Design a protein around this nucleic acid. Sequence first.
DNA 1: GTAGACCTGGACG
DNA 2: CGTCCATGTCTAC
Length: 288
Amino acid sequence: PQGPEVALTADILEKYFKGKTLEYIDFISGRYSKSEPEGYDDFIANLPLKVSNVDTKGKFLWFELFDPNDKSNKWYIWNTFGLTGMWSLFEAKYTRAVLSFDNELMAYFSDMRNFGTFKFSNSEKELKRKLNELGPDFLKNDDIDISKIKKYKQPIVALLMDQKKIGSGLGNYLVAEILYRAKIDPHKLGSNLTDQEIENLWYWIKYETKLAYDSNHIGYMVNLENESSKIGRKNYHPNIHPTEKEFDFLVYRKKKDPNGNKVIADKIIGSGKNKRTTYWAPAIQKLE
DNA sequence: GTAGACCTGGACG
DNA sequence: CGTCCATGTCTAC
């Protein structure tokens, strides 16, 4: 899941668990049932703890907890989703982690491919340094300066997929959709973009991330599509107003764009076993 | 630049 | 059976 999906997940987790007391956390299958997460023993020794917040930056999510009788003792749960990670209020297929709160209340993290990660820390300083490794959140930061793009002689698609250089939160499908809307050839070097293209790009980044965030069932958040329709949406990018009422793929994994133009499944980024497919329509997206 | 890996499928032939 | 693809990210020549 990308930035918008992680942010919405955090919103739902806060709605149901902020203020609740976590009593236990179990890794019933997957990587962590085979080898425990960093800081796990330390953490379980300090439970029960109360959840004060569930926040996100880009595709990174974390829980902040503390003991009511020692507000100073703050603990954190670091979580990344990988390609198939998801949270749910019910024990879905592929459930890896089970969090037990007071009063029989439960939260579950499922992950088919086990690429998601968990880390437990008692250091606010370590979390801060972690957050500083990520660029500003494309969905939550309404005043990002993307003109920094002009300093890089690299394909714009690669710059937007990077989680530090310009901003954080964009993944394979969002970048493809954004570039199509902005009418920019994915191969174009950031150092060759005009100020007008940059202004345009910023607009569509805000448009697409907000649309994705406001959606209820784009696809990979099925275990919560029920909750997505029962919770509101924070007013990120307040001045941008998408017309569609649900996110839809214009080019990602499509043979043709909405108007019949051929879509190329291009291999631009990566090498070896990490190559990604970049979907774009040349009749629309130009280098100039 | 290049290569590999972690893991478990779904879709298609 | 077989093939390719998959909303992520890391490590090494």
